[PDB]
Amino acid sequence: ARRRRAEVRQLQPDLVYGDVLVTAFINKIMRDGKKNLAARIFYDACKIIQEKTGQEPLKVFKQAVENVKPRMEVRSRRVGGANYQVPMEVSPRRQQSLALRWLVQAANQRPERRAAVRIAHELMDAAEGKGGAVKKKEDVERMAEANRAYAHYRW
């Protein structure tokens, strides 16, 4: 907003890993303030990502986050009579959000029936660079790459 830069809310680390990141990701699973259900689904997912690929939920999820962090993105800026799509680096704060948002969103595009599974599977796939959340990442990054021409038009 207009006066000063707003401030990032510090999140309260999650009680099953103390991780500021799981909390964020939990929240983005949360519909309607039903955070209990949110954590459940998530934890259930981890249960699964342990079951199906015998290694650390936390370690896996953190990768899928690292692989969905878009580094460059496009931001529109009308110059003259064209709205040019300009290439911009994404500040880590936003990298995070987009990564978490997309992660959930791809997950909720999956055909597996139950929410808890889908989160698991998308997390699995994205640690390996597969999956929609990684697709969204690259679509974005190819887009910025094409428009490398308009980089000097940046703010």
Partner 1 sequence: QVASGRAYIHASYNNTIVTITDPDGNPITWSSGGVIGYKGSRKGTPYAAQLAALDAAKKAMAYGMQSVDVIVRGTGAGREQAIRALQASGLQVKSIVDDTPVPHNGCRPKKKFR
Q: Which of residues 44-63 bind Mg ion (CB under 5 A)?
A: none
Task: Tell the smallest beta-carbon distance from residue 90 to partner 1 (Å).
Answer: 20
Give phi and psi for 146, each to the nearest 5.
-50, -45
Q: Is 75 helix (H, G, I), strand (E, B) or coil?
A: strand
Question: Among partner 1, RNA, Mg ion, none, what does residue 81 contact (CB within 5–8 Å per kind)?
Answer: RNA
**Shortest distance, CB of residue 78 to RNA, whole angstroms?**
9
Q: Based on CB atoms, which residue is closest to partner 1, 1 or 82?
A: 82
Return the bridge partners of 78, or none: 83
Cα–Cα separations (whole angstroms), residue 133 to 40, 67, 83, 125, 150: 22, 9, 27, 9, 26
What, of Mg ion, RNA, partner 1, none, does residue 79 touch, CB below 5 to 8 Å by kind? RNA
Contacts with partner 1, residue ranges (CB under 8 A): 148-152
